[PDB]
Design a protein around this ligand. Structure first.
Ligand SMILES: *NC(=O)c1cc([SH](*)(=O)O)ccc1OC
Ligand SMILES: *CCC/C=C\CCC*
Lengths: 152, 13
């Protein structure tokens, strides 16, 4: 539905921009203001995650040795497994997307840039299928933006 | 263990 489209748009845009360093110039779809704020939030908060945990993220990438649209399936099982302790929070969600960006960058450097598309799809599926009820209860991307808002 | 590391970082965040 709309939550799926909005999520895939936000996550795809973030991962592609992280991999290429190019901001997409085209307009967002419905609920564009929330999506633009979600992207601002991912840029800002995802930077803190990736820099605080860069060494660990590097080691994770080495472990997985992702080089094919199929190692991404292994990553999907890992990402679902994150939530198997029954704990959900916005920190875990931003962290998964941040690790996704770290992987997207690696995929570009090894010349598999089109795999950023199935990568974005797999991360989106964890939020909008696996954790749909929590996402909706927490107000979706508006809740995400509010959780990470910068105080005056 | 990747999932444990991702969980930890998400709970701190
Ligand atoms: N090492 C892990 O984080 C991991 C975690 C689980 S889960 O039950 O958190 C299962 C297998 C793992 O690695 C093999
Ligand atoms: C999964 C453990 C992470 C350790 C520290 C940071 C918490 C936000």
């Amino acid at each position: 539905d709309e939550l799926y489209r909005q999520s895939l748009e936000i996550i795809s845009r973030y991962l592609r921009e992280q991999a290429t360093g190019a901001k997409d110039t085209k307009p967002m779809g419905r609920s564009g203001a929330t999506s633009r704020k979600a992207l601002e939030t991912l840029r800002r908060v995802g930077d803190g995650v990736q820099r605080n945990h860069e060494t660990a993220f590097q080691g994770m990438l080495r472990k997985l040795d992702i080089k094919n649209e199929d190692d991404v399936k292994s990553l999907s099982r890992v990402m679902i497994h994150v939530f198997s302790d029954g704990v959900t929070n916005w920190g875990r969600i931003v962290t998964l997307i941040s690790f996704g960006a770290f992987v997207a960058k690696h995929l570009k450097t090894i010349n598999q840039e089109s795999c950023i598309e199935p990568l974005a799809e797999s991360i989106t599926d964890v939020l909008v299928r696996t954790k749909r009820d929590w996402l909706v209860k927490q107000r979706g991307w508006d809740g995400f933006v509010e959780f990470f808002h910068v105080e005056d | 263990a990747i999932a444990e590391q991702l969980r930890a970082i998400g709970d701190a965040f």
